[PDB]
Amino acid sequence: SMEQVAMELRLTELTRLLRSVLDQLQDKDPARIFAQPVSLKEVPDYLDHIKHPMDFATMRKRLEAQGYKNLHEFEEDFDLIIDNCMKYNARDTVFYRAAVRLRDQGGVVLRQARREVDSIG
């Protein structure tokens, strides 16, 4: 149907905007702390602590499969990156502090992304 196509075009355009958002958020992580999944070879107890691991590469795979239907879904995954790190790692660590800085800086980006998603529809 034409309606199905139009819905698919909207998903594609959302995917474009989310890719630009994802790029901008990941620039706020120049140490690449959140770039890849936590390794279960290197942190073998991780899944005892963190039930839904998340990282920028895993988000990028979901994105390229057009797997985010709305901005809320995408933000959920971004917040998991931050929140998982802030639980596993103590306050005095470079990991936790990197997470706080990513959260604070990414807030700005996400604030305008929400206005753009609403504005364009």
Q: One-letter amino acid identity for 102?
A: L
User: Which DSSP helix (H) or strand (E) runs through 87?
Assistant: helix 71-88
Residue showing tokens 């800086």 = 105
Residues after which the chain is discontinuous, using a C–N cutoff of 2.5 Å:
none
Q: Which of 71, 61, 74, 76 is nearest to 10 (CA)?
A: 71
Q: What is the resolution of this structure in A?
A: 1.7
In eight-state DSSP terms, residue 104 is H
Contact 38, 80 (CB under 8 A): no
Q: Which domain holds residue 24?
A: 1-121
Q: Give the CATH number of the domain where residue 14 resides.
A: 1.20.920.10
Split into its structural domains, the chain has a count of 1
Helix 2-27, helix 71-88: angle, nearest 10: 30
Max Cα-Cα span within the chain:
56
Give 60: exposed, middle or buried? Use CB within 10 Å, 0-12, 13-18, 19+: middle
Distance between CA 121 and CA 14 in Å, rounded? 9
Number of Cβ within 10 Å of residue 102's Cβ equals 21
